[PDB]
C-alpha cells in the first residue's frame, strides 16, 4: 500500500524517486487513482527479515 | 492441452506431426531447422509445433 | 456537426478515410476505367451518369481528384492559398475546388477535418446538414473502397534513417557535447552569467536545457529531410491522420532529454542523479537524456530516467480525469439561471438581466 | 463548329520527374522566344524527351476524324485563370484535374479565355 | 485483445478465408491491427517483436528479447533475407477479392 | 537503500574494462561499434568503482520482465501491458480442474 | 400576472423558433397518434410525427404558440403565421 | 494452346501454371478452391462418459477438424451423399450422414495415447475412414489417458464447405505471383536504398522478363501467367479439389443463365 | 437494470434544450408517480 492515502492527495510519493532504482518496482501501477501507491518488488529484490 | 491439430492459418494438418517431430528435437541431434523435414515451408502453422506447450503429461496426474 | 464552442466542425474526416484521401487526391493516381466503375456504387445518390474521362490518350484514364470531386455538393467554392504558391502549380500546393470540382492542390487534414474554413464547415452552412450528412456518407466511403484495393500498412523500414544521414545525426548529436563541456566548466570559473529571473544555478541549467532541446531539433529535422517522401509514418503524418514530426525524430534518431516539475532529471539521493554516476555530474551522458532512439534503442543507465518522466505525465493524466469534471460542474451550477427570453435579452432565474443582447 | 485555338509547334528543355512516378512537368519555350509553355502529363504512357518537338493543338470538339486518330495523347479540363500581365499578354492556365497548363502569349492566340474546358491534343 | 505492449485492440469484424490478403506464400493473417495505431503511441518495440518472431521461421531458435543486449534491427534484418524474405519485415500482398 | 549513497557502482563489464585501461592510456575504438546503445564514453574521472550491477534487466517488475524489448518502448506505453497483462487469460495453474 | 397583448400589435419574430418546431411537431405528434382528425391529405405514412411533419410543410396544423414575456403578457401565433 | 503447364507434383499439394485467362478468373479459382468444396467431417457428437481431461465441449471442437475421406462425394446415391439439409429423409439417416464410433478405454498404467486410428465407421466403404497424413502412423492425435478414464463417443458426419465452417475445406492454401519481376507495376515497392536490390527475386521470376529499358513500360498489357500452387489437407487427394473447383464454379454461373432465360 | 443518468448527462440536455426529453428521463421513466394534493395546506390528502 502505502498509507497513506488521506493526506494530500496531489504527488507525493507516487511520482517515481531516483531511489527506487534497483529494488524498482520500475512502472507497474495501477492506472490511475493509486498511481505508484502500489509497486513491486523487483526481480532481485529482498527484504529484511 | 496437446498439439491444436490444424494450423491457425492454413489446414495444414498437424495432430500427427508430433509424436513424430519431440523424435528429433530431443532424439537426433538435429536442429528447430529439423522440422522442415515435415513439410514445414509455411510461416506459419509451423509455428504450431514450435510454440506450443506440452499441458497434459503435467495434467494427466491428478488421479481421481 | 458545429458546436458554437467554437463556430468550427466538431467532427472530420479522421483517421484512415483521411490517411487514403491524401494517398489518392495525388495527381499520381490514375484510375483504370476497370473502375471507377467499381467505385461509382457509392455516393450514395448518383446522378446515374459515368463523369467524362480526363484522359482519352491510349488508355482512357482518371484522374484521383475527378471522381473525388464527385461526392462533394455542386456549387461551393474554396481559396485555400497555402504558404508558398505560383501562379504555378507549383507542385500540387494549396488547394481550391469550384462547381463541386477540385483542381488544385490536394486533400489533406488541412481541408477535409473541423479546419476554420474547413471543407467540411462550408457545406453546413450551405446548404445545411445533407446533402451535407452524405458528405461523410461518400468520401469515408469511396475512399475507403479506394484503399481497401490501393493497400496501406507500416512496418520497421518506415522507422530505420538512411545510413548514410544516419552518420550525420550522430555527429550533431555528439557535435552538441563539446557545447555543454563549454558550459559545466566554464561556469565554474564564474563566466556565466545569469540573469533575469534568476537565478545563476538555474540559468546554467536554462542555457542547457535550451542546447539540448534545439540541438535535438537538427538531429529529427535531418532525419525527416532525409525520407523519401513516399515512406509510410512520414505520409501519415503529412496527411494528419495520427502522429507528428516529433513523432518520427523519438523513433528514428534520439529521444532525450526527459523531464519533470521543470527540470531535468533531479538528483537525491545525495548529490547524484544516480549510482552509476560521479558527483556533481551535470551532464547530459547522465541527468536525463537519451542519444539513442526506440531502435537501438535506450541503455539501462537511461531506461529509467525515460519511465520516470512517464510516471508523471501518468499522473497528470490522472488528474485532468476527475478535477477537470469538477471545474466544469461549477460554472454549470451558476450559470443554468441564465436563458434567453422572448424580448431579444438573456436573464436570470429572477428576471435580473445579465445581457441587452443575445451575446452582445 | 471548327473553334481550333492552338497550332504551334514547342520543344522540351527541362521535365520533372520530381519524386513522381508516374505525371511530369514540361517545358517549352518556342517561336521568339516570347512563348513558352508548360504542363504535367502522364510519363508512364507518353514520356518525352528533349528536343521532342511536334506540335499541339486544343479546340474544343468534337467531330472530326482525322485529328481524333492523329497524335497519341489526349485531355480534358477546365481552365479557371486567365490573367494578364507584363506587356499586355494572356497567360492561361489549364487544369486537367491535378495536371496543370500554362501559356505565355498575346492576341492571336486569344479565341481562347472561354472556360468551356478544352480537351488538349498531342501529336508527336 | 492486446499485444504485450499496451495496444488494447477490440475485434471490430470476422472476415473469413478468402477475403483476407491471401498472399503470396501465400498465408493469411490471423488478426490485423492498423497502421495508426503506431506513430503517435511510438511503440517500435510491437515491430521489432514481429520482426524477431518471424525470424524464428526457417530456423526455430527461440530468439531471446532481452531488455539490454546487443541485438540490434540492423542485426535481425541480415538474418531476414537470410532465408529469402525482406530484410525489413514487409512482404507483397494479394487483395482476397 | 541507504547503502547506496556511499556507493559507486558500475552498469556494464565493459565499462569497468575501459577505465582499467584509460588508468594507463588506451585506444577507444569507437570508429568500429555497429547500430546499438550508444553507451557514455569514456568516463568522467572516476579513478575505481566499487560495485557493478548484476545486469540491468533485473530492474523489473515481476510481470513487466515478461515485455518484449521493453527497453524500447515510450515509457507510458511500458507502464501498461504490466496492469492489464494481469487482466489477461491462460492456464493459472496445472490443477484447477 | 398576465396582461395579453394585441394580435395586432406583436413584438416579437415572425420566424419559427429551432425550439418551436421541435415543439410543435411533438405536439401533433401524440395527437394524430391518438387519433385525431388529420388536416392534410394523408399522403400514405404510418409514423404519427413523419405524418405531422406532412402537415408542417403545408402549414396546416392547428395549435398555436403563448410566448410568454418577462412582463408577464404573451403572444398568440399561429402555425400559418409563423416562418 | 495451351491453359496450364504444371511442374512438380506430390500427395499433398499440386504446382502447375495457368496461361491464356484473366485476373479475375484466377482469383475466382483461388476462392472457390477455399472454400465452397464440398466435403465431409464430423459435426455432432453425443458423449455417454467421459472422466478424461479434455472436456466434452473441447473433443466436439477437436474431433471435428479431424480430415475424413470424400474422394467424389458428389455422385449419388452411393459413394456421395448430398447435404444433409436437403435431404429426401428426417432428420439425421444413414442415407446423408455416416455413423462413427469412439469407444476408448484404459488397460495400462502407464499412460494412453489415442490417435484418429481407434475409430470405427461402419462397413459402407464409403468413404468415410479417416485419413493418416503420419508416416505408417495411425493418424492425428485425439487425447490422452491414464488409469479407468473410458470415453464413449457418437459421431456422425455432414457435408459441408468452408463457409460453413473453416472445419470443411479440403484446402490449405494457394500460392499464387503473377507477374513476378515488375511489368505492370501493380505494386510500388518501398526502397529503403535501391530497389532492384532489396525485394528477392522469387524462385518463380525465372520465367520471364522484362528488365532492360526503358521501352518504355507497357500499359495495353493484362496480367495473364498466373503461377498458383494447391495444397490440400489429405481429406481428399490433391485434386480433386481443383478438378471439382471448377465443376461447382459452372454450376454456378449456370443457376444464373436459367434464371434469365425461362422468364 | 437500470443504467444511469448523471448530474453531467442532464446539463447536458439543457444546453440543446430538450424540455420534454429531460422531463421524460427523469420524472417518467423513472418514477412515474402522481399524488393528490390539498388546496390550502398543500399536502397528500386520503386519496382514493
Known amino acids: 500500500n502505502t498509507p497513506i492515502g488521506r493526506d494530500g492527495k496531489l504527488a507525493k510519493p507516487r511520482q517515481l524517486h531516483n531511489t527506487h532504482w534497483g529494488m524498482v518496482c520500475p512502472a507497474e501501477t495501477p492506472e490511475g487513482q493509486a498511481c505508484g501507491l502500489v509497486k513491486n518488488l523487483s526481480l532481485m529484490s529482498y527484504v529484511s527479515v | 492441452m496437446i498439439i491444436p491439430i ?49 499441458l497434459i503429461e503435467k495434467l494427466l496426474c491428478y488421479n481421481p | 456537426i458545429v458546436s458554437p464552442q467554437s463556430n468550427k466542425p466538431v467532427m472530420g474526416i479522421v483517421q484512415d478515410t483521411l490517411a487514403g484521401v491524401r494517398k489518392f487526391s495525388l495527381r499520381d493516381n490514375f484510375l483504370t476505367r476497370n473502375a471507377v466503375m467499381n467505385i461509382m456504387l457509392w455516393v450514395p445518390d448518383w446522378d446515374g451518369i459515368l463523369p467524362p474521362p ?98 496501406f500498412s507500416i512496418g520497421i523500414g518506415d522507422t530505420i534513417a538512411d545510413a548514410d544521414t544516419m552518420k550525420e545525426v550522430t555527429r550533431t548529436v555528439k557535435e552538441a557535447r563539446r557545447q555543454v563541456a563549454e558550459c559545466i566548466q566554464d561556469a565554474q570559473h564564474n563566466r556565466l552569467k545569469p540573469e533575469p529571473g534568476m537565478t545563476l544555478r538555474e540559468s546554467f541549467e536554462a542555457k542547457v536545457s535550451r542546447i539540448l532541446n ?30 507528428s514530426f516529433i513523432n518520427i525524430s523519438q523513433m528514428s534518431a534520439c529521444v532525450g532529454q526527459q523531464i519533470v516539475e521543470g527540470k531535468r532529471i533531479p538528483f537525491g539521493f545525495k548529490y547524484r542523479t544516480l549510482p552509476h554516476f560521479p558527483k556533481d555530474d551535470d551532464s547530459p551522458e547522465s541527468r ?15 531506461f529509467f530516467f525515460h519511465a520516470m518522466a512517464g510516471r508523471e505525465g501518468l499522473i497528470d493524466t490522472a488528474v485532468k480525469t476527475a478535477e477537470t469534471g469538477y471545474i466544469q460542474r461549477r460554472l454549470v451550477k451558476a450559470m443554468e439561471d441564465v436563458m434567453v427570453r422572448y424580448d431579444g435579452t438573456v436573464r436570470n432565474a429572477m428576471g435580473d438581466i445579465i445581457q441587452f443582447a443575445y451575446g452582445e | 463548329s471548327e473553334s481550333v485555338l492552338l497550332d504551334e509547334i514547342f520543344t522540351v528543355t527541362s521535365v520533372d520527374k520530381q519524386k513522381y512516378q508516374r505525371v511530369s512537368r514540361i517545358t517549352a519555350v518556342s517561336g521568339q522566344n516570347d512563348m513558352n509553355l508548360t504542363l504535367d502529363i502522364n510519363s508512364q504512357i507518353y514520356p518525352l524527351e528533349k528536343d521532342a518537338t511536334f506540335s499541339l493543338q486544343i479546340t474544343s470538339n468534337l467531330n472530326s476524324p482525322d485529328l481524333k486518330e492523329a497524335a497519341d495523347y489526349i485531355m480534358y479540363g477546365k481552365v479557371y485563370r486567365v490573367e494578364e500581365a507584363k506587356d499586355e499578354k494572356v497567360s492561361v492556365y489549364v487544369s486537367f484535374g491535378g495536371l496543370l497548363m500554362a501559356i505565355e502569349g498575346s492576341h492571336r492566340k486569344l479565341y481562347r479565355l472561354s472556360l468551356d474546358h478544352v480537351y488538349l491534343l498531342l501529336r508527336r | 485483445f492486446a499485444s504485450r505492449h499496451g495496444q488494447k485492440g477490440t475485434i471490430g469484424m470476422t472476415y473469413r478465408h478468402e477475403d483476407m490478403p491471401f498472399s503470396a506464400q501465400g498465408i493469411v493473417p490471423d488478426i490485423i491491427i492498423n497502421p495508426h495505431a503506431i506513430p503517435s503511441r511510438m511503440t517500435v518495440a510491437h515491430l521489432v517483436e514481429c520482426q524477431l518472431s518471424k525470424v524464428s521461421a526457417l530456423s526455430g531458435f527461440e530468439g531471446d528479447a532481452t531488455p539490454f543486449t546487443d541485438v540490434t534491427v540492423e542485426a535481425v534484418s541480415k538474418l531476414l533475407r537470410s532465408h529469402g524474405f525482406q530484410s525489413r519485415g514487409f512482404e507483397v500482398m494479394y487483395h482476397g477479392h | 537503500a541507504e547503502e547506496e549513497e556511499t556507493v559507486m557502482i558500475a552498469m556494464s563489464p565493459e565499462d569497468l574494462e575501459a577505465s582499467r585501461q584509460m588508468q594507463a592510456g588506451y585506444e577507444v575504438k569507437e570508429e568500429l561499434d555497429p547500430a546499438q546503445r550508444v553507451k557514455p564514453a569514456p568516463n568522467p574521472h572516476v579513478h575505481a568503482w566499487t560495485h557493478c550491477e548484476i545486469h540491468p534487466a533485473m530492474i523489473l517488475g515481476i510481470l513487466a520482465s515478461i515485455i518484449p524489448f521493453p527497453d524500447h518502448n515510450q ?23 | 400576472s398576465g396582461k395579453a397583448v394585441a394580435k395586432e400589435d406583436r413584438t416579437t419574430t415572425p420566424y419559427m423558433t429551432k425550439y418551436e418546431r421541435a415543439r410543435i411537431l411533438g405536439t401533433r405528434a401524440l395527437q394524430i397518434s391518438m387519433n385525431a382528425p388529420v388536416l392534410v391529405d394523408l399522403e400514405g405514412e404510418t409514423d404519427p410525427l413523419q405524418i405531422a411533419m406532412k402537415e408542417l410543410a403545408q402549414k396546416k396544423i392547428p395549435l398555436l404558440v403563448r410566448r410568454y414575456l418577462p412582463d408577464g403578457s404573451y403572444e398568440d401565433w399561429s402555425v400559418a403565421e409563423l416562418i | 494452346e495451351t491453359h496450364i503447364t504444371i511442374r512438380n507434383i506430390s500427395k499433398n499439394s499440386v504446382d502447375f501454371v495457368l496461361t491464356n485467362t484473366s485476373l479475375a478468373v484466377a482469383n475466382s479459382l483461388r476462392r472457390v478452391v477455399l472454400a465452397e468444396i464440398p466435403t465431409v467431417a464430423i459435426d455432432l457428437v453425443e458423449i455417454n462418459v467421459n472422466t478424461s481431461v479434455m472436456p466434452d465441449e473441447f473433443l466436439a471442437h477437436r474431433l471435428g477438424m479431424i480430415p475424413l475421406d470424400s474422394s467424389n462425394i458428389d455422385e449419388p446415391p452411393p459413394v456421395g451423399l ?125 520465367w520471364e522478363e522484362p528488365p532492360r529499358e526503358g521501352e518504355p513500360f507497357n500499359f495495353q498489357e493484362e496480367p495473364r501467367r498466373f503461377y498458383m500452387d494447391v495444397e490440400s489437407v489429405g481429406s481428399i487427394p490433391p485434386n480433386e479439389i481443383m478438378v471439382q473447383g471448377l465443376r461447382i464454379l459452372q454450376e454456378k454461373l449456370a443457376v444464373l443463365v436459367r434464371d434469365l432465360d425461362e422468364e | 437494470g437500470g443504467l444511469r443518468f448523471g448530474e453531467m448527462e442532464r446539463d447536458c440536455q439543457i444546453s440543446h434544450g430538450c424540455s420534454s426529453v429531460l422531463r421524460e428521463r427523469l420524472f417518467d421513466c423513472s418514477d412515474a408517480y402522481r399524488v393528490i394534493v390539498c388546496d390550502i395546506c398543500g399536502l397528500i390528502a386520503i386519496a382514493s
Open chain 2, 6 to 54: 490444424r494450423c491457425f492459418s492454413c489446414g495444414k494438418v498437424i495432430g500427427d506431426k508430433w509424436d513424430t517431430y519431440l523424435t528429433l528435437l530431443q532424439e537426433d541431434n538435429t536442429e528447430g531447422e529439423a522440422l522442415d523435414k515435415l513439410g514445414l515451408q509455411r510461416y506459419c502453422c509451423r509455428r504450431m509445433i514450435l510454440t506450443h506447450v506440452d
Open chain 3, 54 to 151: 480526363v484522359i482519352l490518350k491510349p488508355k482512357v484514364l482518371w484522374t484521383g481528384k475527378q471522381i473525388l470531386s464527385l461526392i462533394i455538393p455542386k456549387g461551393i467554392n474554396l481559396i485555400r492559398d497555402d504558404d508558398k504558391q505560383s501562379l504555378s502549380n507549383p507542385t500540387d500546393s494549396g488547394m481550391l475546388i469550384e462547381n463541386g470540382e477540385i483542381i488544385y492542390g490536394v486533400v489533406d487534414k488541412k481541408t477535409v477535418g473541423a479546419s476554420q474554413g474547413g471543407l467540411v464547415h462550408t457545406i453546413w452552412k450551405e446548404k445545411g446538414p445533407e446533402i451535407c450528412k452524405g458528405f461523410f456518407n461518400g468520401i469515408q466511403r469511396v475512399v475507403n473502397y479506394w484503399l481497401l484495393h490501393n493497400g
Open chain 3, 214 to 243: 534545439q540541438a535535438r531539433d537538427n538531429a529529427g529535422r535531418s532525419a525527416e529531410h532525409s525520407l523519401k517522401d513516399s515512406n509510410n509514418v512520414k505520409q501519415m503524418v503529412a496527411a494528419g491522420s495520427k502522429g
Open chain 3, 288 to 302: 536525463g537524456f537519451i542519444e539513442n532512439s526506440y531502435l537501438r534503442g535506450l541503455t539501462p543507465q537511461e
Open chain 6, 75 to 97: 515509457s507510458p506505453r511500458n507502464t501498461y501491458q504490466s496492469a492489464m497483462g494481469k487482466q489477461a487469460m491462460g492456464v493459472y495453474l496445472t490443477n484447477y480442474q
Open chain 8, 82 to 206: 448430398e447435404y444433409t439439409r436437403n435431404c429426401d429423409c428426417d432428420q439425421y439417416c444413414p442415407k446423408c450422414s455416416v455413423e462413427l464410433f469412439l469407444n476408448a478405454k484404459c488397460t495400462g498404467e502407464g499412460t494412453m495415447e489415442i490417435y484418429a486410428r481407434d475409430l470405427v465407421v461402419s462397413s459402407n466403404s464409403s468413404l468415410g475412414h479417416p485419413i493418416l497424413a503420419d508416416p505408417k502412423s495411425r493418424g492425428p492425435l485425439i487425447c490422452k489417458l491414464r488409469k479407468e478414464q473410458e470415453i464413449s463417443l457418437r459421431c456422425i458426419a455432414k457435408k459441408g464447405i468452408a463457409k460453413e465452417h473453416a472445419k470443411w475445406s479440403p484446402t490449405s492454401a494457394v500460392a499464387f505471383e503473377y507477374d513476378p519481376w515488375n511489368k505492370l507495376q501493380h505494386t510500388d515497392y518501398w526502397f529503403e536504398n535501391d530497389a532492384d536490390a532489396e525485394w528477392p527475386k522469387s524462385k518463380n521470376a525465372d
